[PDB]
Amino acid sequence: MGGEIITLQAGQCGNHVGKFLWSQLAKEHAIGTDGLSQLPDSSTERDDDTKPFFRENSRNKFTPRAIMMDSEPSVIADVENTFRGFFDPRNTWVASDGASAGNSWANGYDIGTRNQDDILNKIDKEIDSTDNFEGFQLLHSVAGGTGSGLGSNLLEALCDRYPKKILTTYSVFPARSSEVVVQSYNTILALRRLIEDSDATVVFDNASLLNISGKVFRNPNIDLQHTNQLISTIISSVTNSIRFPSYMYSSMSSIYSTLIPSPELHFLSPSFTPFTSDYIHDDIAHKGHSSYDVMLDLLDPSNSLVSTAMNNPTYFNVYNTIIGNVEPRQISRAMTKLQQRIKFPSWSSSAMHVNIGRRSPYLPLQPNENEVSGMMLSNMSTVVNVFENACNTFDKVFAKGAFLNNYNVGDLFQSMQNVQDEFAESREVVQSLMEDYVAAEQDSYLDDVLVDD
């Protein structure tokens, strides 16, 4: 049940994340920034599988199965220049519409619906160029209004264009908002479409990202490129289970089966140990940790990528993937230690899941202290607080209707009352999502069937 996945870069942050992910994949599979594989074509014995992510046009060239779509051509041109021949110039969409006229989800949705024909034709071409398909991976970057609107339009097109494909999305949330009202409006409008159509959604709060980037790096100044490098490494780790096929998980659908118990609960929380493929990765061999300590760090709140705010958190599906020389006895010990420390609901007896992957044979081998890394994905309702931030912002600002002169243009509604009703409906649907989450956090979410047959 393993199929190819096509990458969708949207907005400036999405384009940067996609560029970083493709550079990381090229470094892992020895492809480089030129598009031509650094490994000779005579060595066809490859333990990995670049076919789900790299279209093999020529024997030595591997074009990534990705499409970039942005309103700002500067970032696209910069990516195309720094990757000479690596990316496909035909998969770059700018529409020649100029710079984004604001940071509004309305403008984003408008610029998506206006040129929906071009992006849909490019998607059809990319699908025709391949044979086996499973789904897309969309980068919303909801911090930007134009990118969030473009992602919402792409999702609203893909849901009814390819309903038999599983859709995964990555929504990057900012730590502190400059325009709190506009950014909250954009994020809630994107989460509306996420609830409506998206199958799987992974959140990335920038607060924990900045914390990790200030902790593990030596430079106090934080840059957006090595900030997005963290999400790049996370996406690489979660796609490793398909790139280097393991013996338990070898498909995106098989991975998401144990992570999505219901279409309502489709928000995850990631966590990773101190990375080893980032820029400043020399301070990793001084910890002297084993796989048990790796699991402890994965379950620790200091290594999560989102704001934990752990106040007796209710876990539903906890999954972990360990890459390196892993010991089964140590895995059993870590599982025994975590089953007595992780709060589990009384209605579901499902425990945490462990998977062991394979390390890349061409990546630089690390010393015995951090030669083994780990990734954790937990179905926790702690994201309802990150959502309630923007929810209470909406509740405290919507009483007046500020910044209404920006969401009225571009979209299909030019009046104030229609935009107000749309925002009210979006607030209602996110409130219902939060209510479903806090209801699943309780035991009645399984006693409902016991009381009513």
Partner: protein, 440 residues
């Protein structure tokens, strides 16, 4: 049927022929002196080719059989200073001191018919020197009424002289958006009736679509008429690649006659070339054959200013250069029929002709071209031609209401009846085109 007589009429036709002979010399690596160039090959001529267009002499110097006819001494002086005149014979070219008219008035009048007898014996003497004849090739732009008028006169005389070989006519169509000449739609409509009675097969190529190709595919900032002549040379060279170089599946000129002329009155095949891109992009990008075959159906490669998706599919041809085998173009048409890009019919659909040629495509140094070992030249018969026919007919009818110039035409060599007959004939061809297209 081993020789094809090519005739260059009009200014644009003379420039197209020069680039055609230049690329013909570039493919075989032929220099102005030659003797073959030089005599070591096998297969650069002899053997065929060159044995279809270049006349073989006793010394061995290949003389390209071309008849440059024009009434403008400037173009004739331009073609004579270059080494092309040394390649041709001084008696093959015809010189004119005063231009006929602007543009179709005297081009088809009896004044242009005075030299008709002169070029007739020249063709008879040229056919007597060589042996065999496969067809008559014509290169004149429909924008210039002088080249269109003289080209139609030569076409009518050749039909009544031999009438045994199919008459090929490469016509250049002006831009349907902007027309520099005010009588340009009039010269085209009056010529459509002439090429209807005389030509057995035509060729419709637009200038605006070519300029869009060089600006998008070749990525050049300033288009030029020499760039259009080079692309036409690559087109003409592709249709006769099997007649010039042997291939695994050699196609004949009559094979094009039995594929591109599929109805009692249908002699209008559309030509498309793929892949065409920049030389730099060709070094960076490397597409598959399935991607190239899908590119032949795009509106850009069709060399026409109309969308081919609305058109209805008819019998087509696809010639391939270099190393091409059956499945990669078959699995392409396997998926092309599965994609259903162009709306098929119940009569034609099984009409994707596949022709293979060993000669790889060559890129001219003046105009960029996608450097690829295999090229695709698709000769389609999609029903978008009537859309271009009705487009120029509406501008023709809108103008003909007043037309501001009828006194000059009815006084020199024409009348209002001939304009009405050409209008009714063109409307009859469009009506028959829609009936033969929408009957499925």
């Amino acid at each position: 049927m081993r020789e094809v007589i090519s005739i260059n009429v009009g200014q644009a036709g003379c420039q197209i022929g020069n680039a055609c002979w230049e690329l013909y010399s570039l493919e075989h690596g032929i220099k102005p002196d030659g003797h073959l160039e030089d005599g070591l090959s096998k297969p650069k001529g002899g053997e065929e080719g060159f044995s279809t267009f270049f006349h073989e002499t006793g010394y061995g110097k290949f003389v390209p059989r071309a008849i440059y006819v024009d009434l403008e001494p400037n173009v004739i002086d331009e073609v004579r200073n270059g080494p092309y005149k040394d390649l041709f014979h001084p008696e093959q070219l015809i010189s004119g001191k005063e231009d006929a008219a602007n543009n179709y008035a005297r081009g088809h009048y009896t004044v242009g018919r005075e030299i008709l007898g002169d070029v007739l014996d020249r063709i008879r003497k040229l056919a007597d020197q060589c042996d065999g004849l496969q067809g008559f090739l014509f290169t004149h732009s429909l924008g210039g009424g002088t080249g269109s008028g003289l080209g139609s006169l030569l076409l009518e005389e050749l039909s009544a002289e031999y009438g045994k070989k199919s008459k090929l006519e490469f016509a250049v169509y002006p831009a349907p958006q902007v027309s520099t000449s005010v009588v340009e739609p009039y010269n085209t409509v009056l010529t459509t009736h002439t090429t209807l009675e005389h030509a057995d097969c035509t060729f419709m190529v637009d200038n605006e679509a070519i300029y869009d190709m060089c600006k998008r595919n070749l990525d050049i900032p300033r288009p030029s008429f020499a760039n259009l002549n080079n692309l036409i040379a690559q087109v003409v060279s592709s249709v006769t690649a099997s007649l010039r170089f042997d291939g695994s599946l050699n196609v004949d000129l009559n094979e094009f006659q039995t594929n591109l002329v599929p109805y009692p009155r249908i002699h209008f095949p559309l030509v498309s070339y793929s892949p065409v891109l920049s030389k730099s992009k060709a070094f960076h990008e490397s597409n598959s054959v399935s991607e190239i075959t899908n590119a032949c159906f795009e509106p850009g490669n069709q060399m026409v200013k109309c969308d081919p998706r609305d058109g209805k599919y008819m019998a087509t041809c696809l010639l391939y250069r270099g190393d091409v085998v059956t499945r990669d173009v078959q699995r392409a048409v396997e998926q092309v029929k599965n994609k259903k890009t162009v709306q098929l019919v119940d009569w034609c659909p099984t009409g994707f002709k596949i022709g293979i040629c060993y000669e790889p495509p060559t890129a001219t140094p003046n105009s960029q071209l996608a450097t690829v070992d295999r090229a695709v030249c698709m000769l389609s018969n999609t029903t978008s031609i009537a859309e271009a026919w009705k487009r120029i007919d509406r501008k023709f009818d809108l103008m003909y209401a007043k037309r501001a110039f009828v006194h000059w035409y009815v006084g020199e060599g024409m009348e209002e009846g001939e304009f009405t007959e050409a209008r009714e004939d063109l409307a009859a061809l469009e009506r028959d085109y829609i009936e033969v297209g929408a009957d499925s």
